[PDB]
Write a protein that binds this ligand. Structure first.
Ligand SMILES: [Mg+2]
Ligand SMILES: [Zn+2]
Ligand SMILES: [Zn+2]
Lengths: 1202, 48, 69
DNA sequence: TTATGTAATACGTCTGTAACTTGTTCTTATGTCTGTTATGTAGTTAATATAATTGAAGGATTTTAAGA
C-alpha cells in the first residue's frame, strides 16, 4: 500500500486541509443529556456521529440515509469510528512559536536567523522590539530596540521603518529571509575564513539552510497560525461505573488554549491597553507550548489533583510512550499463563498443558471442528456445548491439539531460547509441566516461576514453530556453539553414582557376556552397581570419512558402566563411559554424539540419559545429614595456633617493632593461610576412606560422602560451599570494602554467634542489592546493543572481498589463554593457508574450518592465519554468508536472512548478570617485544620489553631467566574517552622540545617533509620520547589508557577491532563466560558506519561533514565509473548509543530514545524513511526483512527496480 | 492478535471456517501515532 | 526436521514451501501424495518434502500447468 | 344369421374445491402542530479596599552548547 513515510513541516493550508471543522468553544458535553455541543471539542458536526448511522436530532437513523448531512443538526450519517480519524483546527488570534523548533537545542529558529536564543525569547515574551523592515534608515534587520528606544526612533523616522514585538516579528523575519542568497554568503565566507569555531558555526547554519531549500519547507511554518486538534476518541471523555467521568489531560490543555484564544479575540474588539493584550498573547503562547510539550518552557501546569498534565510529546515519547508500550510490544490474544511444574516423563518436544487452558486457548478451533463434524448446528450451539464441558468436546480438543505446537515463554527473555515451541500433552491440573532439560535455556526453577503460552494460528506460524522454534532444533547455544541441553542436578548425580567404582563390592571379578547380563546381575542382587568386573563390549566407530568399524573385546569395567552403555547409541567409543561421569563427562558424551551422529540420535540419547539418571538417583538414596559434615580435628589446633601467633604479633606491636598497617596486613595474611589450611584438611578428610580388599589388606578409596559426591559430580556445590559448611567461613568485608581482621572461626555446622551473623549480614545485603542494580544495568546494555545491531542481516552469499583479519592464539604471559582451534572453528579462510616453511596450499580460500580442518591445523602447527570477518565485508547493506561463517546454533553455514545482529546483541547481553622475566618453555628468542617460540614454530611466550640473557635467535632452555566487569563493557561499547588518556604520536617524525609556555608545555615534531607539527602536553606527564628520535605513528608518548578513537585514527580498522574484542573478552573470560568473537565484530562493524569528508572533491559532500560510509562508497564507485575525483574520508568510531541515534531511519531513532530531537531534526530536514530494517516493519506491522520474510522483501526490491 | 481491528475478526471467522490464513493490515496504534504527531504540527504521511 | 532442511537447504525456504503445500491441501482441494496417518496438513507437507516429492520448482510447475489448463 | 340386450370401458362433464385477486372498510400507529412550563442566558449592584504561591528536597553518570 505504501513504501515510505515522509516527515516535514506543516503549513497552515495543510493543517486546514486535515481538519473537518473549526473548534470555537471549550464546551465538551451537556450536563443533562450528555450529548456533544455544537462547535465544541467533541462536536458531532466536526468529528462525526456518536452512534452508528445516527444523527444528533435523530431524524436520519438508518443505513438508508448513509452519507446524508442532516439539515437540522449537520451530523453526517456514517460510522462512529470516524471520530478516531477526523481532526479539527483552531484559528489562533496571534501567531505562536512552536516549542520544539525553539527550545530543543540547537534552536532551529535561532540557527536560521543567526540570533541568540535569549534574544528570541525576549522578543517572544514581549520585552524588546525587533526591526522587521529597516527601509531607508541606518537601522538593520534583527537589531533590538527597547520600548523607550522604539519611541525615540519612531519620533525620529516615523513610518520609514517597521519594528514589531512577539511571535509576529519572528514570523516576518523568517518570511523576509532569502535562503539562496544567505547560502551563497555563507559559502563565500567559509571559502575565506580561518577560525575553526566559526567554521563549525557556519557549517551548521549552511546545512540548515540547504536542508530547508531542498526539502521545500518554508521557515515561517515554524510559527503556528492554525493549531490542529486531535480526534476526540483519542482523548475520550467516558462514563465510569458509579456515574463518574474519566477524561484525558489533552482536554484541559485544549480548553485552556481555546479560552485564551477567545479572550484575546474579545480583547481586540473591546480595544484595550497594550499591556493587557500583550499579557494575553503571553498566555496564548504559554498555553500552546504547554499543550505541545509540558515542562519544557518552565513550570509545568498541573491539574486539580496536583500533578503535571500529560502533553502530546508525553504521549509520543518515553518508556510509557506509544513507540515502546504499544508499537514495539503489545498484549496479544490466544495467550495464557500459569505456574510451571516438572515433567520427568516428557520427551524433549513435549510440554504438559492443562485441559482448561487448552479449552480456553483453542476455543475457535473447537467450534470449527464441532461445526464441521456436525454436532453443532450453529456457533451458539458450539459455545453452549463447550461451556457445559461435554465429553465430545474433550475428544475434539485432543484432535485439535494433536499436532498443533504451542510457544512457551519465561520472562526475562534474555535470548531466543527464552521462547520455544513444544507439542502439548493435555494434563489434569492447572500447572504447566516443563521438560527438565530445557530449564537451563529458560533459567527456570520450580520455586514459583510462571510461564506464558501462545498459540500460533496460521499455517506459516505453525511451520515456523515446528521448524525453527521447536525445542529439538535448539539444542546448541548460539553464543558459543556448546550444547545447552546438558543434564544437571539429579541426572548428573545418578549418572555419577552409577558409574562410581567400589573396592570389594559384591560380585567382583565376575565375567559378563555384555550389558544385558550386567543388568541381570544387578536386578538379581548378584552384583552391586559398583562391582569391578570384566564385560564383553561390542563397539562400533564411525570415522570422519564415514567408515563404520565394529569390533568386540573384553574390558575391565563396572556393572553400572555397562548398564549405562546399554543406552549409548552406536558409533561412540566405550572410553566415554568407562569412568566416573561428572557434569563435564556427560556434556562431552552429548557433544561427541552430536558431532559424530547428528541431531535425532542426540535427542534420543539425551532423553534416555535423563531417564536413567533420575531412576538411579532415586535408587541411590543419597541424603544429607548432620554427620555428613565432618569438621576436621586440625581446625581447632590451627585456630589456636593462629590466635597465639596473633597474640605474639600484638605483643610485637606494643613494643613498637612493627607499625599498625604492617600488623593489619600480616594478620590478614595469617588468617588467609589458616583458612586455606583448614579447607585443605577438611577436603583431605572428606575425600577419602579406607576399605578392606579381597586379599584382606587396607586400601585407599574415594569417599562416598553425600556432600562430597554432590560437590565432585558437579551437580550442586563447589569447594567454597563445603568449606563454609565444614571448615571456616573466613574473612568478611565491612560495608565500605575493608576486611575485618578477626574472621568467623565457625562454620554453619556449629553455628555462628550474634556478631558473626551481623558481619555475615553486612555482605549478604551488599550482594543482594548489587544483583538488583546490576540486572537493570545489564538490561539497558542489551537494549542498546539490540538497537545498534538490529539492521545487520545476512543479505548475500559472497561479497567478493580480499580483506581479512589475522588470527593467532591469545597469549597474555607464559601460557596460552585460548588456542587457535577455538578461535578458528567456524570461520572462512580469507588468504590461502600455506604450510610453514613450505609453499604448499594446505587449505584453499573460501573453506569453512570445521572440526576436521581444525585438527589438521593443530597437527601441522600453524600459528597465524587470515580469515574473513564481518567488519571487512563490502556488502552495501548487511553482511554476506562467507564473512560470517558457521552459525553456532545450527552447525552449518549461515543461511541468507539470519538476523545476526540481534543474535550478537543477545549473546553479549545475556551473561551480563554473571558479570561483576624467566622463561617457562624451551625454544628460541625473537625481538620485534620479546617472543619465545617452541621448536615446532609456535609462539608460546609473549613478554614486554621495557626500555637480556639471550640475543635475537638464541635458543633458551626451560627455567632460564632471560630478564568492574559490566561497567567496563558498557564503557567500551560507547567508546568512552579515558579520564587521563595516553598521548600518542600524531605523525611519524623526529621529536624536539619546545617553549615551556606557562601553565602547560608544548612539544614539536619534524616530519619527513620538514614540516613542524606542534603538540599540547600537560605539565604532569612522564614523557617517554627523547629528542633526536624518529618515533613512528602509533607510538606511545605518555603512558596511560588508550582511547579507541585515537587507535582507529592512527593505527587502523583492524587495530580498534582487536582492541575492543580483546578487552571485552578479557572481561568475559575472567568470569568464565564463553562468547564467540564474530558477535563482537558485528557490533564493531556497526560502530564503524560514518565518515567525515576531508576532501570535498566533486561529489555532493561538504568538508567536515559526518555522513554514512556506505553512501560514500556507492558515490565513489559511481564517480570512479565516471572517472571523476573521489572523496577523501576519515572513519569515525561511534558509541552504540550515538550510532543508534544517527541511523538513516528516523522511525528507528525515534523509537530508540531522544524522540523530541530526532523528530525535530527529521521534520526540519524533510527526511524520508524507506522501511528497510526490522524495527520499522515491526511498527507498521509488516514482515521483517529477515528470516522467512526475507524473500518477500527481496521480491519487492525487484518490483521497485522494474 | 492485538490491534488490527478488521484483521482479528477476519482471523476469527477463518479459524471458525477452518482456513488458518490471515490478511494483515495496519495496527491501530500506528494510526494513533500518526494522529498525535500531526497534532504536534508535523506533517507525517505515507507515500505510495 | 533435519531431513527437510537437508533437502531444501534453508529453513526459511522450507517453511515457505511447506506453508504453500499445507494451504493447497487445506484451503484447496489438493490431496496428499503420502499416507495421511492422521496428521495435520503442515506435518504431511513436511513429510512430502522429506520424501522429495514437493519442492519449490515442483509447486511452480504445477501452478503453471494449472494456469495453462 | 342377425336382431337384441346386457355389460365392460373409455371419455366428456357438471359440479364442488380451491387458488388468485380486488373492494372496502375499519383500526391503529405515527407525524405534526400548538400551548404551557422550566431552563438558560444576560445585566447590574456606588463606605474602602491597590506587586502570588506553594512546595521540595541522600542521583549518578554521560554528552553538548553557552559564557568567559
Ligand atoms: Mg525461581
Ligand atoms: Zn439531524
Ligand atoms: Zn563479505
Amino acid at each position: 500500500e505504501f513504501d515510505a513515510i515522509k516527515i516535514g513541516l506543516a503549513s497552515p493550508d495543510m493543517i486546514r486541509s486535515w481538519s473537518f471543522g473549526e473548534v470555537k468553544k471549550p464546551e465538551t458535553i451537556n450536563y443533562r443529556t450528555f450529548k456533544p455541543e455544537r462547535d465544541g471539542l467533541f462536536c458531532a458536526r466536526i468529528f462525526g456521529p456518536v452512534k452508528d448511522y445516527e444523527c444528533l436530532c435523530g431524524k436520519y437513523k438508518r443505513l438508508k440515509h448513509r452519507g446524508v448531512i442532516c439539515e437540522k443538526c449537520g451530523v453526517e450519517v456514517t460510522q462512529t469510528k470516524v471520530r478516531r480519524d477526523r481532526m479539527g483546527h483552531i484559528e489562533l488570534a496571534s501567531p505562536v512559536a512552536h516549542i520544539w523548533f525553539l527550545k530543543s537545542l540547537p534552536s532551529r529558529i535561532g540557527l536560521l536567523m543567526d540570533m541568540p536564543l535569549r534574544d528570541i525569547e525576549r522578543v517572544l515574551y514581549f520585552e524588546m522590539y525587533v526591526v522587521t523592515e529597516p527601509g531607508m534608515t541606518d537601522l538593520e534587520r534583527g537589531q533590538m530596540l527597547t520600548e523607550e528606544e522604539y519611541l525615540d526612533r519612531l519620533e525620529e523616522w516615523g513610518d520609514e521603518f517597521t519594528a514589531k514585538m512577539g511571535a509576529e516579528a519572528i514570523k516576518d523575519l523568517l518570511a523576509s529571509m532569502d535562503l539562496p542568497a544567505e547560502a551563497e554568503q555563507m559559502r563565500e565566507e567559509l571559502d575565506t575564513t580561518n577560525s575553526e569555531t566559526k567554521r563549525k558555526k557556519l557549517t551548521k547554519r549552511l546545512k540548515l539552510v540547504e536542508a530547508f531549500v531542498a526539502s521545500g519547507n518554508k521557515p515561517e511554518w515554524m510559527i503556528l497560525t492554525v493549531l490542529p486538534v486531535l480526534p476526540p476518541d483519542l482523548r475520550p471523555l467516558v462514563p465510569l461505573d458509579g456515574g463518574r467521568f474519566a477524561t484525558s489531560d489533552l482536554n484541559d490543555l485544549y480548553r485552556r488554549v481555546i479560552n485564551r484564544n477567545n479572550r484575546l479575540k474579545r480583547l481586540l474588539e473591546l480595544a484595550a491597553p497594550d499591556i493587557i493584550v500583550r499579557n494575553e498573547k503571553r498566555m496564548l503562547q504559554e498555553s500552546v507550548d504547554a499543550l505541545l510539550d509540558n515542562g519544557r518552557r518552565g513550570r509545568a501546569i498541573t491539574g486539580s489533583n496536583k500533578r503535571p498534565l500529560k502533553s502530546l510529546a508525553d504521549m509520543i515519547k518515553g518508556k510509557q510512550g506509544r513507540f515502546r508500550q504499544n508499537l514495539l510490544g503489545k498484549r496479544v490474544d490466544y495467550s495464557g499463563r500459569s505456574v510451571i511444574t516438572v515433567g520427568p516423563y516428557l520427551r524433549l518436544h513435549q510440554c504438559g498443558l492443562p485441559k482448561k487452558m487448552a479449552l480456553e486457548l483453542f476455543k475457535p478451533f473447537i467450534y470449527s471442528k464441532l461445526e464441521t463434524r456436525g454436532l453443532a448446528t450453529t456457533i451458539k450451539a458450539a459455545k453452549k456445548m463447550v461451556e457445559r464441558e461435554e465429553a465430545v468436546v474433550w475428544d475434539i480438543l485432543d484432535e485439535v491439539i494433536r499436532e498443533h505446537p504451542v510457544l512457551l515463554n519465561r520472562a526475562p527473555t534474555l535470548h531466543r531460547l527464552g521462547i520455544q515451541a513444544f507439542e502439548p500433552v493435555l494434563i489434569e491440573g492447572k500447572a504447566i509441566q516443563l521438560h527438565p532439560l530445557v530449564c537451563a535455556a529458560y533459567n527456570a526453577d520450580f520455586d514459583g516461576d510462571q510461564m506464558a503460552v501462545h498459540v500460533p494460528l496460521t499455517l506459516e506460524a505453525q511451520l515456523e514453530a515446528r521448524t525453527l522454534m521447536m525445542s529439538t532444533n535448539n539444542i546448541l547455544s548460539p553464543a558459543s556453539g556448546d550444547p545447552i541441553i546438558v543434564p544437571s542436578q539429579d541426572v548428573v548425580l545418578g549418572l555419577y553414582y552409577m558409574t562410581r567404582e567400589k573396592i570389594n563390592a559384591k560380585g567382583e571379578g565376575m565375567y559378563l557376556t555384555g550389558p544385558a547380563e550386567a543388568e541381570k546381575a544387578y536386578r538379581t542382587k548378584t552384583a552391586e552397581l559398583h562391582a569391578r568386573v570384566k564385560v564383553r563390549i561390542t563397539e562400533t566407530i564411525k570415522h570422519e570419512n564415514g567408515k563404520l568399524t565394529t569390533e568386540t573385546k573384553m574390558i575391565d569395567t563396572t556393572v553400572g558402566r555397562a548398564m549405562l552403555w546399554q543406552i549409548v547409541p552406536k558409533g561412540l567409543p566405550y572410553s566415554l563411559v568407562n569412568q566416573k561421569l561428572g557434569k563435564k563427562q556427560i556434556s562431552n558424551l552429548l557433544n561427541e554424539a552430536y558431532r559424530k551422529l547428528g541431531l535425532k540420535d542426540t535427542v534420543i540419547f539425551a532423553d534416555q540419559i535423563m531417564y536413567t539418571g533420575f531412576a538411579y538417583a532415586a535408587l541411590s538414596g543419597v541424603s544429607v545429614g548432620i554427620d555428613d559434615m565432618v569438621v576436621p580435628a586440625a581446625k581447632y589446633t590451627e585456630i589456636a595456633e593462629a590466635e597465639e601467633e596473633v597474640r605474639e604479633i600484638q605483643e610485637q606491636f606494643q613494643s613498637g617493632l612493627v607499625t599498625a598497617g604492617e600488623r593489619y596486613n600480616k594478620v590478614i595474611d595469617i588468617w588467609a593461610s589458616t583458612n586455606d589450611r583448614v579447607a585443605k584438611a577438611m577436603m583431605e578428610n572428606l575425600s577419602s576412606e579406607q576399605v578392606i580388599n579381597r586379599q584382606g589388606e587396607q586400601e585407599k578409596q574415594e569417599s562416598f560422602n553425600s556432600i562430597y559426591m554432590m560437590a565432585d559430580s558437579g551437580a550442586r556445590g563447589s569447594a567454597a560451599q563445603i568449606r563454609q559448611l565444614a571448615g571456616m567461613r573466613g574473612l568478611m568485608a565491612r560495608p565500605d570494602g575493608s576486611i575485618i581482621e578477626t574472621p568467623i572461626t565457625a562454620n554453619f555446622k556449629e553455628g555462628l554467634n550474634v556478631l558473626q551473623y551481623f558481619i555475615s549480614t553486612h555482605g549478604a545485603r551488599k550482594g543482594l542489592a548489587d544483583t538488583a542494580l546490576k540486572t537493570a544495568n545489564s538490561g539497558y546494555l542489551t537494549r542498546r546493543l539490540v538497537d545498534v545491531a538490529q539492521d545487520v542481516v545476512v543479505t548475500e552469499h559472497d561479497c567478493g572481498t580480499l580483506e581479512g583479519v589475522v588470527m593467532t592464539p591469545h597469549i597474555e604471559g607464559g601460557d596460552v589463554k585460548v588456542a587457535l582451534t577455538e578461535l578458528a572453528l567456524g570461520r572462512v579462510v580469507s588468504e590461502d593457508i600455506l604450510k610453514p616453511g613450505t609453499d604448499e596450499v594446505l587449505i584453499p580460500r573460501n573453506t569453512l574450518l570445521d572440526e576436521k580442518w581444525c585438527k589438521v591445523i593443530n597437527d601441522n602447527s600453524v600459528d597465524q592465519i587470515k580469515v574473513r570477518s564481518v567488519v571487512t565485508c563490502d556488502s552495501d547493506f548487511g553482511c554476506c554468508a562467507q564473512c560470517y561463517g558457521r552459525d553456532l546454533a545450527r552447525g552449518h553455514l549461515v543461511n541468507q536472512g539470519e538476523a545476526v545482529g540481534v543474535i550478537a546483541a543477545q549473546s553479549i547481553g545475556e551473561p551480563g548478570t554473571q558479570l561483576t622475566i624467566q622463561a617457562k618453555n624451551n625454544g628460541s628468542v625473537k625481538l620485534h617485544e620479546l617472543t619465545i617460540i617452541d621448536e615446532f614454530g609456535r609462539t608460546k611466550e609473549k613478554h614486554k620489553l621495557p626500555y637480556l640473557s639471550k640475543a635475537d635467535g638464541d635458543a633458551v632452555a626451560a627455567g632460564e631467566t632471560v630478564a568492574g566487569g559490566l561497567p567496563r563493557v558498557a564503557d567500551l561499547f560507547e567508546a568512552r574517552k579515558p579520564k587521563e588518556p595516553a598521548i600518542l604520536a600524531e605523525h611519524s617524525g623526529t621529536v624536539s622540545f619546545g617553549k615551556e609556555t606557562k601553565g602547560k608545555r608544548r612539544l614539536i615534531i619534524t616530519r619527513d617533509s620538514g614540516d613542524t607539527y606542534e603538540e599540547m602536553i600537560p605539565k604532569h606527564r612522564q614523557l617517554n620520547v627523547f629528542e633526536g628520535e624518529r618515533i613512528e605513528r602509533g607510538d606511545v608518548i605518555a603512558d596511560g589508557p588508550e582511547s579507541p578513537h585515537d587507535i582507529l585514527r592512527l593505527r587502523g580498522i583492524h587495530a580498534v577491532t582487536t582492541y575492543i574484542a580483546n578487552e571485552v573478552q578479557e572481561v568475559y573470560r575472567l568470569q568464565g563466560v564463553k562468547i564467540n568473537d564474530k558477535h563482537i565484530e558485528t557490533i564493531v562493524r556497526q560502530m564503524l558506519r560514518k565518515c567525515t569528508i576531508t576532501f570535498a572533491g566533486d561529489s555532493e559532500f561538504l568538508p567536515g561533514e559526518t555522513v554514512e560510509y556506505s553512501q560514500v562508497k556507492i558515490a565513489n564507485r559511481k564517480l570512479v565509473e565516471e572517472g571523476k575525483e573521489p572523496a577523501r574520508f576519515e572513519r569515525e568510531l561511534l558509541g552504540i548509543t550515538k550510532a543508534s541515534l544517527a541511523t538513516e531511519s528516523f522511525i528507528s531513532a525515534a523509537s530508540f530514545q531522544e524522540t523530541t530531537r530526532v523528530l525535530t531534526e527529521a521534520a526540519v530536514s524533510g527526511k524520508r524513511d524507506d522501511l528497510r530494517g526490522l524495527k520499522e516493519n515491526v511498527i507498521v506491522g509488516r514482515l521483517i526483512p529477515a528470516g522467512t520474510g526475507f524473500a518477500y522483501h527481496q521480491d519487492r526490491q525487484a518490483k521497485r527496480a522494474q | 492478535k492485538s490491534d488490527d481491528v478488521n484483521g482479528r475478526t477476519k482471523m476469527y471467522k477463518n479459524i471458525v471456517d477452518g482456513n488458518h490464513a490471515m490478511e494483515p493490515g495496519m495496527p491501530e496504534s500506528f494510526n494513533v501515532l500518526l494522529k498525535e504527531i500531526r497534532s504536534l504540527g508535523i506533517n507525517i504521511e505515507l507515500e505510495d | 526436521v533435519q531431513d527437510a532442511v537437508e533437502k531444501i537447504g534453508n529453513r526459511f525456504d522450507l517453511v515457505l514451501v511447506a506453508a504453500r503445500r499445507a494451504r493447497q491441501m487445506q484451503s484447496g482441494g489438493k490431496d496428499a501424495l503420502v499416507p495421511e496417518e492422521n496428521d495435520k496438513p503442515t506435518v504431511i507437507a513436511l513429510r512430502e518434502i522429506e520424501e522429495g516429492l514437493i519442492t519449490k520448482d515442483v509447486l511452480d510447475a504445477r501452478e503453471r500447468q494449472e494456469q495453462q489448463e
